[PDB]
Amino acid sequence: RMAEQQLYIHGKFVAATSGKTFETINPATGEVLATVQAAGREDVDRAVKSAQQGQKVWAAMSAMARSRILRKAVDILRERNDELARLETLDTGKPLSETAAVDIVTGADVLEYYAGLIPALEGSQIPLRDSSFVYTRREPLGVVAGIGAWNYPIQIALWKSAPALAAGNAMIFKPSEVTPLTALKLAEIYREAGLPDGVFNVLPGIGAETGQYLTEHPDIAKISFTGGVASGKKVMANSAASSLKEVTMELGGKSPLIIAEDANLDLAADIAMMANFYSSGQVCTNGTRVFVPAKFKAEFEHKILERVGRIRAGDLFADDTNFGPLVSFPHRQNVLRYIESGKSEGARLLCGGDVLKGEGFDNGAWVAPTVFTDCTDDMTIVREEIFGPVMSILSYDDEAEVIRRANATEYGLAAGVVTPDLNRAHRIIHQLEAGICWINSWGESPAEMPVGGYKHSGIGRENGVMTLQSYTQVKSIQVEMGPFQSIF
Amino acid sequence: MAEQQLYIHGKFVAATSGKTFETINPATGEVLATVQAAGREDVDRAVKSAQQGQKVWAAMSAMARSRILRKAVDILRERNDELARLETLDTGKPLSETAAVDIVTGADVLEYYAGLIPALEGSQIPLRDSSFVYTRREPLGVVAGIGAWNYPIQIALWKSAPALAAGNAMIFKPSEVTPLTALKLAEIYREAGLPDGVFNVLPGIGAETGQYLTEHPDIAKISFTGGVASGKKVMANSAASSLKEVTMELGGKSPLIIAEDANLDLAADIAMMANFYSSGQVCTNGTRVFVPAKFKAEFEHKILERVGRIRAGDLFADDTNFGPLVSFPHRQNVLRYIESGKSEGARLLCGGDVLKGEGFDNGAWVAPTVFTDCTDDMTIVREEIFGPVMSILSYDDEAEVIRRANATEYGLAAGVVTPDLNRAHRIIHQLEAGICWINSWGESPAEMPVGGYKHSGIGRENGVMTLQSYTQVKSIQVEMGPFQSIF
Amino acid sequence: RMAEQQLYIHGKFVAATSGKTFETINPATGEVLATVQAAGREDVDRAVKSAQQGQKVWAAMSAMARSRILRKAVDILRERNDELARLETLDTGKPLSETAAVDIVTGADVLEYYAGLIPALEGSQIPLRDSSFVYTRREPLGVVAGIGAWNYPIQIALWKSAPALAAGNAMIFKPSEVTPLTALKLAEIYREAGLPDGVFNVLPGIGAETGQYLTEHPDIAKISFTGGVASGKKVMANSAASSLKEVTMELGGKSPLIIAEDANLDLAADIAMMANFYSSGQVCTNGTRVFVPAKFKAEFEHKILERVGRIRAGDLFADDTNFGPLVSFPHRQNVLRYIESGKSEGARLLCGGDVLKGEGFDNGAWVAPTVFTDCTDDMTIVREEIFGPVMSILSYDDEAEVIRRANATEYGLAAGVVTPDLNRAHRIIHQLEAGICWINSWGESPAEMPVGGYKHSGIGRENGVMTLQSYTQVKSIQVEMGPFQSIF
Amino acid sequence: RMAEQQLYIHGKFVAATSGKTFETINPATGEVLATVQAAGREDVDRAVKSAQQGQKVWAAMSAMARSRILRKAVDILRERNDELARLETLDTGKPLSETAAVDIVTGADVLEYYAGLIPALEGSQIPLRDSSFVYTRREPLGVVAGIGAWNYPIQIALWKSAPALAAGNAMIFKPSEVTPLTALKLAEIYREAGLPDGVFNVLPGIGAETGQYLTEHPDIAKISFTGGVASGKKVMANSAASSLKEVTMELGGKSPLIIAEDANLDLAADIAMMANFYSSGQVCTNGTRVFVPAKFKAEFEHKILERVGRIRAGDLFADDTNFGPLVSFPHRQNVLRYIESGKSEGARLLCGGDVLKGEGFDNGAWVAPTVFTDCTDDMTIVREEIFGPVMSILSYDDEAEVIRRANATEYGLAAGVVTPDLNRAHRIIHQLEAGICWINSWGESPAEMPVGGYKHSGIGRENGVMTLQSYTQVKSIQVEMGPFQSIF
Ligand SMILES: Nc1nc2c(ncn2[C@@H]2O[C@H](COP(=O)(O)O)[C@@H](O)[C@H]2O)c(=O)[nH]1
Ligand SMILES: Nc1nc2c(ncn2[C@@H]2O[C@H](COP(=O)(O)O)[C@@H](O)[C@H]2O)c(=O)[nH]1
Ligand SMILES: Nc1nc2c(ncn2[C@@H]2O[C@H](COP(=O)(O)O)[C@@H](O)[C@H]2O)c(=O)[nH]1
Ligand SMILES: [Cl-]
Ligand SMILES: [Cl-]
């Protein structure tokens, strides 16, 4: 077993003063991975004052000095990629085949990206007249808070802290109570790279206490939240009631995958598989509404079933395992409730629909890869994000119809189209009300590419140059060199 | 005047609320007009009208949109005086202000954004020979603006100009105190060729019409200007309902720092313009004036001399430069703060009472008021008054004044008066405010982003960035290589 | 006959002091349109001193004051579009069906575009440390010169003067001696719009004198030239040798049009026609090397023959005329020599190849629309810009081959591909060495879109936000607020 | 002495086929440092073909892969700083106190800066209408050539190669024949960092042969030149006559230092010293015209004499040496000619004016720190760049006068003002016709700050984000999804 996990405040581990702890479970076995201390209201106050002190040191350094420190953190993350991925697999249940290739690789890609952009962060200068001009400064916000989710723990920590730190802020990061372990490791790595004490503090805890204490704190200038749509609305409200914080939200979706009448169905089946069953379906951007032309539906169903049969659940550290248990046993219960609603509302179950059983599965939170067909737009499984391995296949007749049905949702995160035709690909994508659109692919999220939701799926964006800027605030300065005229 | 209706889809329409309210002329106490209030059903009609207009509007070319907004600018320039007189009647601000500032600078911002529409561009990012990303800056759709009463038509233009320029339709709710010019603007936009529904105006009260807007599920963004308390309610309800993007321009308690090397005639002029324009009803006003102790007595003399030249009177008279407050309930709140200053030991330098006599007894007048000997714990020093109440505070050294200038939950504006190169930039760089003026006050060019730090605001208005903030980024990856599935 | 045309200097017409004149001819009839004064060395020096004085007034105005004046000029151009187009047709020989729909419309579009961008022209601000920061100004160059070509006289005058003026400069414009008339009209329009005197001066003359005097003048900060590749090299040399001027050059090309194996051949033929025979083939961006798959070549040739048979030469003011004479008898002589070279080098003449004869044609320099096929990469007509209505059709077998052959040229101006396939369209275009690339279209040049040549086809760009910036020069300013340390 | 120095082509040293060599002299002793092979016409052609091959590999890599390789070159340069600085001191005669603190540090600072910006290099996307859009690519130019100067050999090589490589190009670099050695070392360092073979080739040689072969080559797309005004005009002409290359030129200046009437004269004297005597006056940006108010002139002259007496010439490797010989004996002869010109025209010699003599100086190309006063705007030493340690002090009476005199020159490189007054500093700087402006300082050139000349002092800029973009060329691509309409 691991040692009791403490808070990370001001460059060292420190005991919480809340007197409270929680446990994180290994979802493959049900065993306790670690007991974790929970940050109380006073621990949060201590973290903010640590962050205020560190942020001043960090911002006073030169831009290239900050760049070099983050680059050293990148180097450590590349060296420790396999070790960090193994820890992430234990905490999340995701196969090592995923965590060692994606989670830290792409988290570090984003930190590496923003490290190089720090010196390009510039204000503007605006001439008004010969005797007066304006210039702007992109100043740090100060202390910002990141609230992470459990499906990509260290990647989310990196995607939130990289731009925040790169812009000259300190960040207090609260990982999900489900998956707190890699965030604490990241804090140690940042310190090892030379990040000033206090610039990245980590506070494990539960949302109702530690999360709320951060969102309410008067000296936190911005909150960045990743999680479910409902919890997001609550976070965003509480941030306004306290001190009118800036907000960023990356929430869930019900993203449509549109298969065009001229699509190759093997390619379409491969994209739908990767859009539904990666990380056991626990991805906010998953293409869980798969729209297929009626004339191709039966053949598409056959190709999905063939690929589903190739899914390899088992030992999460085995090279050939590509499917894991869900992150927790309560989450499995929620996915199973959705599956039962699909059955009772008349969707046709093509495969899966139950837990996995037998040696090596009975103690883990496993759900079989599940595919429903003959789905309709009013069904619960079609309208609501499930966050488990459940694909809904929907038939359609014409392009105008599928665009309307694709857009007829409160969600807005991602979308995609499969077509070899130039006009159809751009024409359709331009009409879809989603922030992340994939043509003949799914899932790739380059550090350069801003990502976030339309409508109820988000506020603001992550990644790209714009996100570095969104972690600064503009100060406009007018220099008046002419004589000032008063009307009094 | 005739009973004022809602403006929905290019025409005046009766409200379905069965409710009305009155707007009072603050100079006479008389009712200017009865105004229909938009109910929950009216808001839904406005949204559906806005959805229809926005699609027509967004389908036009960028230059087609530019030309239509430019035509609205031409109409606003022509009707500057007519609109200003209506603004004066509704707000109590002197015609000397409304005819020179309110429509002029409102139109300036609309004109600025009209020209930037064709420059609104996405990006393209190569990943590898076989895949690239490009982005679109798409309209949000239907957005809502909630205006304040101190600059009714200017606020309406500063919100609607970037929103319309970005391809959105806007539903605008003016303050119930000052609803009249927003309705005039709606007619002007239509006359310019704005498609029906792209700018709808829904007068009403904040507790009903404003709340219905913040709650509507099909509104993508709310832009609010007003007080801090009302703002927190707006931003909460916008999140609880449909997770709207939000922009907030709130009040402040902005510091004016007079340096030890400042010319005191210049410093006094800046302090005057920072406190008594629009009778002190300006969000950015420099209501905490920090003066070095060694010059405090002389500065107080120079302020008193200039206060003596203030000309209250007929708001349509050329030489009038001071008006009544926007309403009698607001005057009562301002008087509550003034009495707080007296009881907490601040020294009254001038004013502090209502104005009396022929032509003033019927208006909501408060005399220009100056407190000195102020300390950082006083209520008048800590809280926004939004009336003509200057607070003068003494200081000894530069480090102190910076700490005290920043020791506030507000973050809107700030300024320094000094002829020294290093001092001006050095001090300004350390102040926690979004709008900083050196050797001046109040100028807000269309090019210059403005908004608050800390409790004074969220987001910005004006400048290129605000046009972008009325769009949403769509990222599109083109994968020309063979897609690899691990299953 | 028109009245004698004078120089335009400092807001009024003025006699040249050179004592020299030239005539501009109506290319449809041979009649003298007007006698035109030629600017001498002293006239250029007067124009520069006028421009220097006007530029200071212009640059001192507010940004929106400049914007409003250029917009008034736009409004005048819209109102007089048909009158100016008729003058352009008389001077150039291009059909009114073209000049009234393109030349002034698109010239004014660019002026309107830049008029609106003036307030967005901004510098930068760069923090170095707490005690020092840098800011930049985008200052006007001062006095710049534009040298126009004869195929699009007023359009070029607008595309050069609009960004130059919007950036705060004065421009001295030298129109082609072939086509000086609309530039003089534009100068009056600017003044009527409120442009300060001296900000746009126009100096007709011949290239060997007036053009050379401008390129040599020591107080002209930049030369922008449109013309042939050969003449361009001469101008760029003289500008460097005299005073080290900044330079922009829009030269000719031999642009490839690649027809993919999956293209609809009616669409491909329509694009090829528009890419070769608009303005009687006198267009720098024309797609004069048409690459067609071997298996479709015969059918494509038939479709070209059918469309060529529809070309309607005749009265240039008639609605149905869509083909005009070449601008002059010397230019037709050169085109005729290229046609004869094609015949003698073994290319197969598909149609045309001769002068037009008979009533209405004997007085103009008309050449029949000409198409050569069976062309090979070594032929003179394939390698060299003809600037007449001469299409070369080349067969190809595979995609790698056609990209190689398309790129095997010193020219670099434009290119295009015809294909409905998403991957093919972007994949091919990304490999073509040209600045202006069209997918399933040809010729459109939006004000927003920077256009210019690779390799020998140009230096710099016109249109787009970047061209406004390129008519400014960057000044960097460091404010050092810390104590300066000397090592001596 | 060193072994015969070879060319660097395609990742290795290779013997030249020209049969020609030249020698580089140690300016402190007159000894031959090394015999160096000169690249011939055939050698330039091999280098270009090597560069074309390397550039294709380099450009095909990911952006972050290119960033990492340039960052490894940075790390090696930091490590080998002292070794490289000693070599630079031997080759240039600049004191080790300079070369070890400035030359490699600031060269590497720029490489490090551009390494981080590679992922931020983005094109644009422009919607035209629902059925058509434009997007742009910032493509590499291909093979570019940089031609270096002798005063900052490795710094110039880094400032040219860093943006060029970061933008995806290969560069062929020709160092000055006076100082060829550190460029060859840089070529090895790049390869050691993982730069693909051919991406950075170094061709020592003379300007009239090797330099000309580069400017003439048809497959080099851009020339970047740093040197004198005269040779620049020659280079820019030959580049146009051959293949219409893009050009950047960083030439000399006669930059003014304006001392305001409210300036502290100790600060002004310190700024004037650093603006004139660093690198023994061999800096293009030097403030060689020092304008002082008449009322302060006598006191300022005394303060200059005091500080000139503190200059410590001697052993270039001694810690306390801060002044060196000139780069070569022929260059000293030209500097002496300028000094005699000052005497013959009646300028008053305040100090210096002769060679240094005695043990340790008789064998080196030493010139004493020289200050002329009572200078006027028509004097040769005032009008012409000397590129030696020669300060000219000019009296003035009022602000308008000094701005006019500061600007009355063909040069435009730098300028500066000394004043504590807010309005005066910005007011004056905004009116000066120079690209590089310093307030209350001199000489600092941050990687973020674009630098280059107005008027005859240059074309284009170096450093800053704009210089990364200027090493790409814009390709505009229109996607037309609507039906194309032909008028034929
Ligand atoms: N998008 C998203 N949804 C989540 C996440 N965690 C839980 N959910 C969703 O929220 C609900 C349960 O959340 P809980 O109340 O257990 O935190 C379920 O609908 C579940 O799918 C998360 O990290 N991201
Ligand atoms: N690209 C281009 N070529 C031109 C232009 N004017 C003339 N030429 C070319 O120059 C040659 C003869 O014209 P000249 O410039 O000698 O009068 C021919 O090759 C002709 O096509 C022009 O404006 N653009
Ligand atoms: N600005 C500048 N001038 C130079 C440079 N090298 C030589 N010069 C100047 O050019 C002239 C000729 O010197 P040369 O080029 O033959 O060494 C002299 O006035 C010399 O000072 C250089 O690298 N930069
Ligand atoms: Cl491990
Ligand atoms: Cl009236």
Give chain A's domains with CATH numbers.
Answer: 7-252+449-474 (3.40.605.10), 255-439 (3.40.309.10)
A56 burial level (CB within 10 Å; 0-12, 13-18, 19+): middle
β partners of residue C472: C140
- Between CA B335 and CA B331 the distance in angstroms is 6
Of A26, A25, A57, A20, the closest CA to residue A38 belongs to: A20
- Report DSSP state, residue C365: B
Ligand 1: does its nearest atom lie under 6 Å from the Cβ of A151?
yes
- To which H or E segment does residue B241 belong? helix B228-242
- Between CA A428 and CA A262 the distance in angstroms is 14
| Inter-residue contact D283 to D106 (CB < 8 Å) | no
Question: What is the strand order of the sheet B199-201 is part of?
Answer: B12-13, B6-7, B199-201, B169-173, B142-146, B221-225, B245-249, B457-458
Minimum-distance CB partner of D136 among C450, C454, C483: C450
D192 burial level (CB within 10 Å; 0-12, 13-18, 19+): exposed
Of C406, C408, C342, the closest CA to residue C370 belongs to: C342
- Between CA C471 and CA C145 the distance in angstroms is 11
- Between CA A218 and CA B411 the distance in angstroms is 14
- Between CA D227 and CA D218 the distance in angstroms is 23
- To which H or E segment does residue A405 belong? helix A399-407
β partners of residue B36: B20
Instruction: Choose one of A254, A334, A386, A436 to mutate for the ligand 1 pocket test, by most ligand atoms within 8 angstroms of C-beta.
Output: A334
CA of B75 to the centre of ligand 5 (A): 17
Minimum-distance CB partner of C478 among D128, D277, D444: D444
Phi–psi pair at C330, nearest 5 degrees: -60, -40
- Between CA D166 and CA A209 the distance in angstroms is 48
- Residue in chain B nearest C429 by alpha carbon: B129
Other Cβ atoms closer than 10 A to A270:
23
Structure tokens at C411: 């020219």
- Between CA C86 and CA B75 the distance in angstroms is 34
Distances (CA, A) of C261 to C209, C270, C295, C303, C419: 51, 16, 8, 16, 8
- Between CA D240 and CA C283 the distance in angstroms is 23
In C17-122, where do the E strands start and end? 21-25, 32-37
- To which H or E segment does residue C131 belong? none
The string of DSSP letters for B29-40 reads --EEEEEE---H
> Angle at Cα D198 formed by Cα D194 and Cα D201, nearest 5°?
100
CA of A228 to the centre of ligand 1 (A): 5
Residue C315: strand, helix, or coil: coil
Of B192, B193, B191, B171, the closest CA to residue B182 belongs to: B171
Query: In this structure, are strands C21-25 and C32-37 parallel, antiparallel, or unpaired?
Result: antiparallel
Measure the CA dihedral D56/D61/D64/D67, to 10°.
-40
Measure the CA dihedral B419/B423/B428/B431, to 10°.
-130
> Residue C14 is which amino acid?
V
| Inter-residue contact D420 to C460 (CB < 8 Å) | no
Taking the alpha carbons of D204, D210, D211, D214 in that order, is the dihedral positive or negative? Answer: negative
- Report DSSP state, residue A24: E
| Inter-residue contact A71 to A121 (CB < 8 Å) | no
- Between CA D450 and CA D457 the distance in angstroms is 14
| Inter-residue contact B247 to B222 (CB < 8 Å) | yes
Distances (CA, A) of B40 to A17, B18, B212, B221, D16: 49, 11, 6, 18, 86
Rg of the Cα trace of chain A? Answer: 24
Contacts of A125 in chain C (CB under 8 A): 122-125, 135-137
Q: Is C375 a catalytic residue?
A: no
Residue C431: strand, helix, or coil: helix
The string of DSSP letters for D294-308 reads GGGHHHHHHHHHHHH
Of C449, C432, C428, C397, the closest CA to residue C253 belongs to: C432
Distances (CA, A) of B13 to B180, B213, B280, B379, C278: 15, 18, 36, 45, 53
Q: A–C: how many Cβ contacts below 8 A?
A: 56
Q: What secondary structure, in 3-state letters, does B101-153 show?
A: HHHHHHHHHHHHHHHHHHHCCEEEEEEECCEEEEEEEEECCEEEEECCCCCHH
Interhelix angle C104-117/B103-116, rounded to 10 degrees, is 130
Q: Which residue has the tokens 């390899």?
A: A312
Q: What secondary structure, in 3-state letters, does D337-391 show?
A: HHHHHHHHCCCEEEECCCCCCCCCCCCCCCCCCEEEECCCCCCHHHHCCCCCCEE
* Reported resolution, Å: 2.2
- Between CA D329 and CA D366 the distance in angstroms is 9
| Inter-residue contact D310 to C488 (CB < 8 Å) | yes
- Between CA B367 and CA B275 the distance in angstroms is 12
| Inter-residue contact C219 to C138 (CB < 8 Å) | no
Structure tokens at C322: 């869509």
Rg of the Cα trace of chain C? Answer: 24
> Angle at Cα B382 formed by Cα B381 and Cα B383, nearest 5°?
105
> Angle at Cα C106 formed by Cα C6 and Cα C469, nearest 5°?
85
Q: How was this structure determined?
A: X-ray
Phi–psi pair at C89, nearest 5 degrees: -60, -45
Q: Is D122 a catalytic residue?
A: no
A229-238 per-residue burial string, b: 16 or more CB within 10 A, e: under 16: bebbbbbbbb
- To which H or E segment does residue C106 belong? helix C104-117
| Inter-residue contact B420 to D422 (CB < 8 Å) | yes
| Inter-residue contact C405 to C362 (CB < 8 Å) | no
Phi–psi pair at B333, nearest 5 degrees: -65, -40
* Backbone φ/ψ region at C200: left (φ over 0), alpha (ψ -120 to 50), beta: beta
> Residue A257 is which amino acid?
L
CA of A21 to the centre of ligand 1 (A): 22
Other Cβ atoms closer than 10 A to D434:
27
Structure tokens at A377: 């737009």
Distances (CA, A) of D427 to C474, D260, D407, D423: 17, 12, 15, 6
- Between CA A337 and CA A386 the distance in angstroms is 9
| Inter-residue contact C220 to C210 (CB < 8 Å) | no
- To which H or E segment does residue C155 belong? helix C153-166
Structure tokens at D466: 């704009």
- Between CA B139 and CA B116 the distance in angstroms is 15
Of C182, C179, C170, C275, the closest CA to residue C227 belongs to: C179
Of A388, A365, A369, the closest CA to residue A91 belongs to: A365
- Report DSSP state, residue C101: I
Other Cβ atoms closer than 10 A to A265:
18
- Between CA D455 and CA D458 the distance in angstroms is 7
Give the ranges where D193-291 is alpha helix by DSSP (H): 212-216, 229-243, 265-277
β partners of residue B438: A479, B416
- Between CA B224 and CA B217 the distance in angstroms is 17
- Between CA D95 and CA B149 the distance in angstroms is 69
| Inter-residue contact D316 to D280 (CB < 8 Å) | no
Rg of the Cα trace of chain B? Answer: 24
Name, in order, each residue with C-beta under 8 angstroms of C163's C-beta and a sequence gap of 6 or more.
C110, C114, C462, C463, C467, C468, C470, C471
Distances (CA, A) of D470 to A325, C135, D450: 52, 20, 12
Other Cβ atoms closer than 10 A to A83:
12
Taking the alpha carbons of D463, D468, D472, D477 in that order, is the dihedral positive or negative? Answer: negative
Atom of ligand 1 nearest to the CA of A230: 10
Ligand 2: does its nearest atom lie under 6 Å from the Cβ of C228?
yes
- Between CA D64 and CA D49 the distance in angstroms is 26
CA-proximal residue: ligand 3, atom 11 (nearest): D228
| Inter-residue contact A194 to A72 (CB < 8 Å) | yes
CA of D228 to the centre of ligand 3 (A): 5
- Between CA D183 and CA D175 the distance in angstroms is 7
Other Cβ atoms closer than 10 A to D362:
11
Name, in order, each residue with C-beta under 8 angstroms of A79's C-beta and a sequence gap of 6 or more.
none
> Angle at Cα B188 formed by Cα B186 and Cα B189, nearest 5°?
65
- The closest ligand to the CA of B88 turns out to be 5
> Residue D231 is which amino acid?
S
Minimum-distance CB partner of C127 among A137, A420, A423: A137
C58-68 per-residue burial string, b: 16 or more CB within 10 A, e: under 16: bbeeebbebbb
- Between CA D25 and CA A273 the distance in angstroms is 70
| Inter-residue contact A488 to B276 (CB < 8 Å) | yes
- Report DSSP state, residue B4: B
Structure tokens at B96: 């000397």
In A348-446, where do the E strands start and end? 348-351, 370-373, 390-396, 414-418, 436-439
| Inter-residue contact A376 to A398 (CB < 8 Å) | no
**Residue of A55, A484, A485 to mutate, testing the B interface (most B Cβ within 10 Å of its Cβ):** A484
Phi–psi pair at C407, nearest 5 degrees: -85, -10
- Residue in chain C nearest D456 by alpha carbon: C244
Q: Which residue has the tokens 């190849």?
A: C353
Q: Which residue has the tokens 């339309």?
A: A454
Phi–psi pair at A381, nearest 5 degrees: -65, -20
CA-proximal residue: ligand 3, atom 3 (nearest): D228
- Between CA B29 and CA B289 the distance in angstroms is 33
Q: How far is C-alpha A217 from the geometric centre of its chain's CA atoms?
A: 23
| Inter-residue contact A255 to A221 (CB < 8 Å) | no
Contacts of C130 in chain B (CB under 8 A): 429
Max CA distance (Å), chain A? 88
Q: Which residue has the tokens 């309307």?
A: A404
| Inter-residue contact C39 to C177 (CB < 8 Å) | no
Phi–psi pair at D436, nearest 5 degrees: -125, 110
C73 burial level (CB within 10 Å; 0-12, 13-18, 19+): buried
- Between CA A233 and CA C352 the distance in angstroms is 72
Structure tokens at A200: 């990245």
Residue B201: strand, helix, or coil: strand
Which chain residues have CB less than 5 Å from ligand 4, an ion? A 83, 86
Distances (CA, A) of A173 to A153, A198, C240, D328: 11, 11, 58, 60
- Between CA D85 and CA A128 the distance in angstroms is 46
Of A118, A172, A112, the closest CA to residue A142 belongs to: A172
Query: In this structure, are strands A436-439 and A7-9 parallel, antiparallel, or unpaired?
Result: unpaired
**Residue of D62, D118, D125 to mutate, testing the B interface (most B Cβ within 10 Å of its Cβ):** D125
In A326-461, where do the E strands start and end? 348-351, 370-373, 390-396, 414-418, 436-439, 458-459
Distances (CA, A) of B64 to A289, C110, C160, D432: 38, 14, 23, 41
SS3 content of chain B, % helix, strand, coil (to 5): 45, 20, 35
Q: What secondary structure, in 3-state letters, does D29-69 show?
A: CCCEEEEEECCCHHHHHHHHHHHHHHHHHHHHCCHHHHHHH
Query: In this structure, are strands D289-293 and D390-396 parallel, antiparallel, or unpaired?
Result: parallel
Name, in order, each residue with C-beta under 8 angstroms of A477's C-beta and a sequence gap of 6 or more.
A134, A135, A136, A137, B428, B436, B437, B438
In B129-254, where do the E strands start and end? 131-139, 142-146, 169-173, 199-201, 221-225, 245-249
Ligand 2: does its nearest atom lie under 6 Å from the Cβ of C284?
yes
| Inter-residue contact D391 to D283 (CB < 8 Å) | no
